RNA sequence: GAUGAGUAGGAGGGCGCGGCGGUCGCUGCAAAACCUUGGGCGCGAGCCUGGGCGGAGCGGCCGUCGGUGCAGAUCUUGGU
RNA sequence: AAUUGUCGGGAGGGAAGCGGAUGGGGGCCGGCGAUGCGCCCCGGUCGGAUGUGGAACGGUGACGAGCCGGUCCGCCGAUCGACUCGGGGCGUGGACCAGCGUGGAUUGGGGGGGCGGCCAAAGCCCGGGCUUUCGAUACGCCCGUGGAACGCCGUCUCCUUGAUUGUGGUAGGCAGCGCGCGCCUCCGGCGUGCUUCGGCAUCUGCGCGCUCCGGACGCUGGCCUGUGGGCUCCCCAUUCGA
């Protein structure tokens, strides 16, 4: 089994090497030599017979239309380069609009996992859409924060009362986050204060 | 705007179906539409085109003229999209294989007596 | 019944084509009439005037004549006429004719309920 | 005598995609475009690497004597390009034109 | 092979110019064999001769473009309709982009997009043209079957110029748009395609 | 696949009214007609329907027929 | 119907009416907008072979034979199936409206890079000579295969963005490309030919897969009798047209 790609991609859909070099690297010559100057022929995989589906209980009077095959498969949501672990984010929408929070990681669904910390500004471990967030240049060390066991399933609704386990988890996660925050002076006040636009403040000119 | 005559549309009119309401003629038209589509035969295309034509565009053929044109070709099936009428100026009637939309009674009797056959277009 | 139609219904215009000057003269009715006057601004299509109908406003053929519920109308005068829609209940709905009596309307409604046929005016004369 | 029946004649028109944007359509219309793009990218990368390393070779396509001849010919051509007429054909306007 | 040929042709032209300068003489470039013509006036109030010539050139709509082989007859025909069109010497890039983006072939008098080489093969296979690159080479070099290839190419339906026009009522020489703008037709093609 | 201007004028396909030959139906458990900021279909001529009033007939479909479609005529009669 | 009175709603700086777009108010609409489906357990009803007899009958053939066949009824075995039957579990599921993600088509922007042409740029700078000025301390000329940085034009390419939009519904097609079918010391290397010495569609076969590849899919939320949603209906206001 080859441990490295044979043909690195210069760009999407174009390989760095040509067909002749690919032949040489793949070693089709070697296979021909070993098999006696002829490529080995492999029989086509046998298809699995369909299961004995029971007869239908009803017969529709119309032939429902089967949709045509769509060959496009969605790709994972991209994370903006301006957002990295420990980055300070500004929430632009929702009940926490204007709040400054800390970014921890991106979940499988593409949403961003953030914490206030809860004690500083009352924002708990939450999921925020990247489209409703501003990434600032302020970064805080988050190496000591462990959120491995927290994932997209942590926030799934079982369908009024917050379990004490979630509160304990928030406290455990926020202890290290607050300890790291304490290193940077005034970061406590920065995180506890919300962002707002004053007179003659231009968002298209603010750098963040 | 586009510099075209009548927006590039045709201004010629031709028959695309019989104007008659004869059900037998309609069935023949269906038959020869299928033949034209699935064989691409020039003879079939001509027959289909003539099946649409009006009465004056399907003139009859006299028996004497039919005999004159069939002379030397009695082994071939003579086909006319129209009527075949008898001629009292024709004395000798040979055995002929004739296909037409209609035969007059005298012409049919003379052909059958001479030993030919009168055929329809389905038989053709 | 689940309607078979899937394409959304699109109306190019939902306003009526009212006859010009029917607002002005009572004797002139609203039903459309194409002006033929030599000087008629409506006929000449002067901007800001009454619009004239044309084939360009034609509805999409797939959704043509389809009611908002997603079915097509069919007028039924009796329960015997109702059974014609037994094999078309996913495309056609039944509307009871205006002159049917309440007694026959009840039977038609019951039969349609049995046959899973939509009635547009099943609450009439109840 | 009927010809074989046909079932795949009523195919939907294929949507036209501009080959200048998407690669697959470009390759389908012209496979050599792949090689052209690969060679162009590799050449650009090589040029950038040479410029960055500053180890570029000192290449002289034309030898010294022929370069001197080329320079002399170019200088003569430029001189004749900028040359001006003597304006001696207009006698009545010599003073105005400044020939004297 | 075609790409190599184009590169070699450009290099040869440059070398010929340089060697002419070195020898001290002049090299007269070969006259353009191909023109691209774009209609710039509408169809209103047309003179009979102008309208007929525009039909013969296959320019029936404003902002339609067509290739034209350079000939005495064709040039004299174009001289009559000069005020209604602007034309020039297309680039290899211009021709390639036109055929790739807006190239439509004529099959049975129908306009079919050139989404596959089979469309070209069906019509020009007898002449050895079976691919888009073959068509481009034939058009640019004005080969033996240039007439067939060009007639196969449906007139190009170009959009309105991206940056507008200067003045279509005046010749390009006076600062307008009508007439022969030679090598400057390429930038107009960029803006019109 | 291409295409879309239209007075005078020509033609095609359709809508609507009243009879006749057939056919399928509705109606005192309420027909025709009329009324209605009820609802819907058709580009449109028009059509289907809720509700009211009315109190005795009426409609769809296939052919076929005609004293068959109004905004004008200092149009006619009546009414205002 | 014209026309008139009354009540209720509404509007009104020298006409009114009208076309187009929204909005305020009113009026109307529940096929206005779903709650089913699949797999199991329990209980209740109705039927259960290719076996054996009867009743009538059909396809084909030739409204003959032969062959084949369905419906209904009676029995020995078999002990299964169904229910718009009831209860209990697991999964899944609707209309409409929004947000988001990834992409196709079309299109308008932004930021770079490579190559070539020119007086084989012009200029600037470094050295070697010649020249010697009035806007006084200049203009300047060529010699070097001297060195950096540009300019215009042409051309090849990379990245990143806003807007409109998804027409079709039996295809894994076409094109390009990866992994296995050999090995090693695995940012790679090892074979035969042609090369411009960089490289090359020269060997390029099968199986399984991927993509900018024969026209949009996926996730989440709000709401469902409500002060909700919709409206082609009605009265008005406003901008444009008239
Ligand atoms: K009126
Ligand atoms: K018209
Ligand atoms: K009747
Ligand atoms: K009504
Ligand atoms: K009638
Ligand atoms: K998009
Ligand atoms: Mg066009
Ligand atoms: Mg003029
Ligand atoms: Mg009468
Ligand atoms: Mg009144």
């Amino acid at each position: 089994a080859k441990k490295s790609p044979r043909n690195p991609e210069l760009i999407r859909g174009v390989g760095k090497l040509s067909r002749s070099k690919m032949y040489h690297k793949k070693g089709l010559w070697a296979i021909k030599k070993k098999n006696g100057g002829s490529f080995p022929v492999h029989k086509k995989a046998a298809a699995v017979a369909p299961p004995a589906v029971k007869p239908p209980k009803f017969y529709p009077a119309d032939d429902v239309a089967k949709p045509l095959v769509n060959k496009h498969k969605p790709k994972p949501t991209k994370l903006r380069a301006s957002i990295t672990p420990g980055t300070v984010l500004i929430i632009l929408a929702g009940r926490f609009k204007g709040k400054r929070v800390v970014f921890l990681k991106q979940l499988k669904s593409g949403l961003l996992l953030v914490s206030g910390p809860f004690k500083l500004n009352g924002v708990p471990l939450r999921r925020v859409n990247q489209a409703y967030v501003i990434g600032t240049s302020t970064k805080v060390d988050i190496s000591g924060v462990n959120v491995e066991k927290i994932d997209d399933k942590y926030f799934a609704k079982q369908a009024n009362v917050l379990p004490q386990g979630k509160k304990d988890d928030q406290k455990a996660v926020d202890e290290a986050l607050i300890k790291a925050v304490e290193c940077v002076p005034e970061l406590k006040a920065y995180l506890s204060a919300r962002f707002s636009l004053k007179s003659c403040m231009k968002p298209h000119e603010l750098v963040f | 705007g586009i510099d075209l005559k009548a927006g590039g549309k045709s201004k010629k009119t031709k028959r695309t179906a019989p104007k008659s309401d004869d059900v037998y003629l309609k069935l023949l038209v269906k038959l020869y539409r299928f033949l034209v589509r699935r064989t691409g035969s020039k003879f079939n295309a001509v027959i289909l085109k003539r099946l649409f034509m009006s009465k004056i565009n399907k003139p009859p053929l006299s028996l004497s003229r039919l005999i004159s044109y069939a002379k030397g070709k009695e082994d071939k099936v003579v086909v006319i999209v129209g009527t075949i009428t008898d001629d009292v100026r024709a004395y000798e009637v040979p055995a002929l294989k004739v296909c037409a939309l209609r035969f007059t009674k005298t012409a049919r009797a003379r052909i059958e007596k001479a030993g030919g056959e009168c055929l329809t277009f389905d038989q053709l | 019944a689940v309607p078979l139609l899937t394409k959304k219904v699109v109306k190019k215009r939902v306003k009526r084509f009212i006859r010009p000057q029917s607002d002005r003269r009572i004797t002139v009715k609203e039903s459309w009439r194409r002006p033929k006057g030599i000087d008629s601004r409506v006929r000449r299509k002067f901007k800001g005037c009454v619009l004239m109908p044309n084939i360009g406003y034609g509805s999409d053929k797939k959704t043509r004549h389809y009611l908002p519920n997603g079915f097509k109308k069919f007028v039924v005068h009796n329960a015997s006429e109702l059974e014609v829609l037994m094999m078309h209940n996913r495309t056609y709905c039944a509307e009871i004719a205006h002159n049917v009596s309440t007694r026959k309307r009840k039977e038609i409604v019951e039969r349609a309920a049995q046959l899973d046929v939509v009635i547009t005016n099943k609450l009439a004369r109840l | 005598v009927v010809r074989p029946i046909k079932k795949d004649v009523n195919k939907r028109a294929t949507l036209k995609k501009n080959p200048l944007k998407n690669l697959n359509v470009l390759l389908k219309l012209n496979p050599y475009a792949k090689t052209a793009r690969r060679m162009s990218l590799l050449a650009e990368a090589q040029r950038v690497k040479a410029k960055k390393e500053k180890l570029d070779k000192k290449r002289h396509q034309v030898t010294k004597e022929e370069a001197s001849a080329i320079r002399a010919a170019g200088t003569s051509w430029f001189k004749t390009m900028i040359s001006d007429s003597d304006y001696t054909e207009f006698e009545n306007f010599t003073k105005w034109l400044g020939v004297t | 092979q075609y790409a190599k040929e184009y590169e070699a042709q450009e290099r040869e032209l440059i070398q010929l110019k340089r060697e002419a300068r070195l020898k001290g003489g002049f090299y007269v470039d070969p006259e353009a064999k191909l023109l691209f013509i774009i209609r710039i006036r509408g169809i209103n109030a047309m003179a009979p001769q102008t309208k007929k010539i525009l039909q013969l050139l296959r320019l029936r709509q404003i902002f339609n473009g067509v290739f034209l082989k350079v000939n005495k007859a064709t040039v004299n025909m174009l001289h009559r309709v000069e005020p209604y069109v602007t034309y020039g010497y297309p680039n290899l890039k211009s021709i390639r982009e036109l055929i790739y983006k807006r190239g439509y072939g004529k099959v049975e008098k129908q306009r079919i997009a050139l989404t596959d080489n089979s469309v070209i093969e069906q019509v020009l296979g007898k002449h050895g043209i079976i691919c888009i690159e073959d068509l481009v080479h034939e058009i640019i070099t004005v080969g033996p079957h240039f007439k067939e290839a060009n007639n196969f190419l449906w007139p190009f339906q170009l959009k309105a110029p991206l940056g507008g026009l200067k003045k279509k009522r005046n010749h390009y020489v006076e600062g307008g748009d009508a007439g022969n703008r030679e090598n400057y037709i390429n930038e107009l093609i960029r803006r019109m395609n």
Side-chain angles (χ1 to χ4, degrees):
Chain A
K2 190 76 154 55
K3 296 186 177 180
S4 206
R6 278 195 199 81
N7 205 353
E9 271 188 349
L10 293 168
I11 56 144
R12 200 169 48 101
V14 176
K16 183 187 199 283
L17 313 167
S18 64
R19 275 151 89 111
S20 71
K21 190 65 171 173
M22 263 335 271
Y23 186 108
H24 166 78
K25 290 178 83 80
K26 274 150 58 217
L28 272 63
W29 50 275
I31 293 162
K32 285 259 282 291
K33 155 230 307 183
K34 162 152 164 185
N35 278 122
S38 266
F39 282 113
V41 190
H42 315 269
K43 305 176 176 177
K44 212 142 190 144
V48 183
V53 185
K54 63 220 290 296
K57 296 138 84 284
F58 195 81
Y59 288 105
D62 314 87
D63 278 326
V64 82
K66 205 205 237 160
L68 291 177
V69 168
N70 185 359
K71 288 190 174 195
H72 287 145
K73 290 180 265 191
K75 313 178 194 181
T77 303
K78 294 174 227 61
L79 175 82
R80 285 203 294 267
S82 89
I83 298 168
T84 41
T87 305
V88 172
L89 307 173
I90 290 160
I91 303 177
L92 318 166
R95 66 163 283 175
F96 295 127
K97 59 170 70 66
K99 291 274 187 170
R100 291 185 263 256
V101 299
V102 187
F103 167 73
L104 303 170
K105 73 184 175 198
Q106 187 192 29
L107 304 170
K108 188 172 175 192
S109 59
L111 300 171
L112 314 172
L113 173 72
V114 305
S115 205
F118 176 74
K119 262 203 90 60
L120 291 204
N121 51 48
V123 172
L125 287 162
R126 212 172 194 256
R127 302 191 301 180
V128 287
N129 198 296
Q130 183 181 205
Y132 294 91
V133 152
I134 280 196
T136 66
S137 318
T138 301
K139 271 75 171 155
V140 68
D141 194 75
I142 53 93
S143 89
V145 182
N146 181 290
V147 280
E148 287 168 339
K149 63 94 146 205
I150 295 203
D151 56 331
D152 268 317
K153 274 56 38 182
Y154 195 80
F155 313 85
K157 294 185 72 170
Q158 298 181 353
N160 183 9
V161 152
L162 191 68
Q164 189 58 42
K166 286 190 181 284
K167 298 183 180 182
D168 295 346
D169 264 330
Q170 180 98 60
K171 256 166 267 162
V173 152
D174 283 348
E175 184 277 23
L177 190 48
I178 280 152
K179 169 158 28 83
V181 157
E182 286 328 339
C183 323
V184 189
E186 298 281 17
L187 195 61
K188 268 197 39 44
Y190 183 55
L191 286 178
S192 315
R194 279 173 294 171
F195 173 81
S196 191
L197 294 157
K198 306 303 295 181
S199 209
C200 297
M201 261 171 102
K202 289 173 187 183
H204 65 274
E205 277 319 343
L206 299 167
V207 313
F208 294 109
Chain B
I2 308 167
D3 183 30
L4 287 175
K5 271 216 234 164
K9 301 196 291 297
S10 181
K11 282 176 79 174
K12 314 301 294 300
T13 183
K14 67 144 151 273
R15 284 248 179 131
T16 56
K19 217 179 171 64
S20 164
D21 262 359
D22 193 330
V23 291
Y24 299 99
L25 176 58
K26 279 161 105 157
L27 295 179
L28 288 171
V29 161
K30 275 177 182 171
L31 164 61
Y32 271 91
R33 270 194 215 281
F34 169 85
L35 279 182
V36 162
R37 181 164 54 79
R38 291 292 302 283
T39 66
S41 160
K42 292 133 79 84
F43 172 92
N44 284 334
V46 168
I47 293 298
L48 175 66
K49 173 147 170 52
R50 297 204 184 143
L51 282 169
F52 303 159
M53 278 165 207
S54 66
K55 185 183 175 176
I56 58 161
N57 286 326
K58 305 178 294 186
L61 183 71
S62 85
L63 176 54
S64 75
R65 200 71 111 182
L66 166 63
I67 289 159
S68 151
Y69 292 161
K71 196 158 323 299
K73 284 99 83 180
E74 302 177 26
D75 81 276
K76 330 202 91 56
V77 178
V78 314
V79 182
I80 175 151
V81 185
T83 310
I84 290 172
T85 60
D86 183 31
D87 211 322
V88 300
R89 300 165 298 183
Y91 307 120
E92 304 302 302
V93 192
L96 305 133
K97 285 176 306 323
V98 190
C99 176
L101 284 177
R102 190 173 50 90
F103 295 79
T104 66
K105 302 184 282 277
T106 45
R108 176 185 295 280
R110 287 193 80 190
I111 293 158
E112 263 141 17
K113 176 198 199 213
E117 35 200 291
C118 296
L119 302 174
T120 57
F121 276 84
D122 49 310
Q123 288 167 336
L124 181 72
Chain C
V2 173
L4 203 65
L5 178 63
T6 278
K7 188 164 168 107
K8 266 79 207 143
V9 176
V10 175
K11 314 279 190 184
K12 295 176 168 171
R13 166 183 175 91
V14 295
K15 284 191 179 188
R16 282 288 216 141
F17 279 96
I18 285 166
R19 188 173 171 184
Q21 302 205 308
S22 59
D23 61 315
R24 172 217 217 281
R25 288 288 295 270
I26 297 141
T27 202
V28 180
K29 277 158 168 102
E30 304 236 275
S31 59
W32 175 251
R33 292 288 181 288
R34 182 166 174 92
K36 274 85 157 186
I38 59 177
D39 301 328
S40 162
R41 64 214 283 231
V42 182
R43 188 183 65 70
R44 294 201 256 174
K45 300 178 169 180
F46 283 33
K47 79 168 182 173
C49 300
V50 168
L51 290 171
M52 290 184 305
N54 59 76
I55 196 67
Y57 292 93
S59 274
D60 179 75
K61 276 192 267 83
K62 280 142 147 264
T63 56
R64 199 190 274 154
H65 289 289
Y66 270 93
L67 310 172
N69 55 4
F71 300 83
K72 267 158 91 143
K73 178 182 291 223
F74 183 66
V75 180
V76 293
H77 297 86
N78 45 61
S80 302
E81 241 178 83
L82 186 57
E83 97 203 287
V84 175
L85 305 171
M86 209 222 296
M87 306 307 302
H88 313 273
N89 64 343
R90 288 203 65 192
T91 295
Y92 277 100
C93 62
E95 180 148 81
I96 298 169
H98 76 287
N99 40 357
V100 183
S101 69
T102 166
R103 179 209 38 251
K104 204 160 262 176
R105 281 170 120 112
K106 291 202 219 72
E107 301 149 2
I108 291 171
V109 164
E110 163 158 8
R111 181 65 178 159
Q114 269 165 13
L115 262 44
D116 190 13
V117 172
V118 179
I119 288 149
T120 54
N121 61 346
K122 84 227 289 164
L123 256 52
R125 307 210 189 186
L126 287 209
Chain D
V1 290
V2 294
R3 57 146 172 81
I5 207 171
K6 272 126 59 146
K7 295 100 72 176
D8 300 336
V9 184
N10 300 343
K11 85 175 190 83
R12 193 145 190 81
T14 172
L15 169 61
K16 182 186 210 312
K17 311 186 167 185
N18 181 357
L20 304 164
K21 309 151 172 153
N22 41 7
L23 180 66
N24 282 355
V25 170
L26 183 64
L27 301 194
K28 192 187 196 204
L29 284 165
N30 173 26
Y32 185 71
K34 182 103 173 301
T35 291
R37 185 85 53 89
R38 174 183 288 118
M39 287 174 324
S40 147
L41 289 169
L42 288 180
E44 168 156 345
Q46 195 267 138
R47 292 297 309 123
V48 167
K49 182 205 192 18
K51 258 195 205 131
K52 190 190 79 180
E53 294 185 339
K54 291 177 181 188
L55 255 290
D56 193 356
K57 229 67 172 180
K58 185 185 285 295
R59 303 186 62 172
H60 287 121
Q61 308 157 349
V62 187
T63 50
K64 193 173 173 182
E65 69 289 7
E66 325 178 326
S68 313
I70 289 158
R71 250 184 326 253
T75 306
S76 171
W77 181 236
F78 175 71
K79 248 149 217 182
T80 176
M81 256 170 63
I82 60 160
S83 72
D84 216 339
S85 77
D86 40 71
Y87 294 98
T88 62
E89 46 269 45
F90 321 123
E91 337 287 347
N92 301 113
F93 299 93
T94 284
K95 197 182 154 233
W96 180 71
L97 282 159
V99 188
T100 60
Chain E
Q1 177 60 51
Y2 296 152
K4 192 229 191 142
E5 172 201 301
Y6 305 137
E7 269 127 35
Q9 183 183 12
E10 275 146 37
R11 270 313 118 191
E12 180 60 16
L13 170 54
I14 281 152
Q15 180 237 315
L16 283 158
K17 286 160 144 304
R18 273 164 178 179
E19 162 211 77
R21 178 157 307 172
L22 188 72
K23 256 149 41 201
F26 315 92
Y27 180 76
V28 193
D29 289 310
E31 320 183 75
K33 317 191 260 69
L34 177 73
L35 304 169
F36 192 65
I37 303 150
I38 291 143
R39 177 162 184 168
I40 51 160
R41 275 202 178 267
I43 54 161
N44 297 104
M46 302 291 308
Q49 182 185 254
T50 302
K51 159 137 52 69
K52 182 67 176 177
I53 292 164
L54 284 166
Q55 302 186 18
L56 292 179
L57 299 176
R58 290 190 313 161
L59 296 159
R60 279 164 193 287
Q61 181 176 42
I62 198 160
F63 306 149
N64 279 18
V66 295
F67 293 119
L68 190 71
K69 87 209 293 192
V70 171
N71 238 324
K72 181 147 193 177
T74 67
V75 157
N76 284 29
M77 263 165 66
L78 180 60
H79 174 94
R80 268 106 174 143
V81 301
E82 161 182 288
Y84 284 76
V85 309
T86 186
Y87 53 101
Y89 315 142
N91 229 336
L92 165 60
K93 181 199 199 285
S94 284
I95 294 159
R96 186 169 281 151
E97 277 177 333
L98 276 161
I99 281 162
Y100 278 36
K101 191 177 163 70
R102 303 189 177 276
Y104 286 77
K106 189 163 73 178
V107 194
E108 282 103 46
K109 310 181 167 59
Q110 315 224 121
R111 192 189 178 242
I112 297 89
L114 305 173
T115 58
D116 198 81
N117 292 299
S118 60
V119 179
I120 282 162
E121 170 134 43
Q122 147 153 15
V123 182
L124 307 175
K126 330 174 280 163
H127 306 299
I129 302 168
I130 56 168
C131 76
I132 203 93
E133 256 319 278
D134 262 0
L135 185 64
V136 165
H137 176 266
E138 195 73 18
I139 294 288
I140 206 191
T141 66
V142 190
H145 311 109
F146 173 91
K147 165 202 193 66
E148 287 87 61
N150 197 47
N151 203 258
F152 164 72
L153 275 169
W154 200 278
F156 298 82
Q157 316 292 294
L158 310 162
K159 70 179 177 199
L162 203 148
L165 301 168
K166 296 271 154 43
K167 274 188 292 195
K168 62 159 137 210
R169 66 185 182 279
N170 291 332
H171 204 276
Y172 187 80
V173 161
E174 314 159 299
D177 300 295
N180 191 350
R181 69 174 70 191
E182 308 188 327
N183 51 311
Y184 286 100
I185 198 77
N186 293 305
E187 77 93 40
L188 179 63
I189 292 173
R190 305 284 162 283
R191 292 192 296 123
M192 293 213 77
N193 189 11

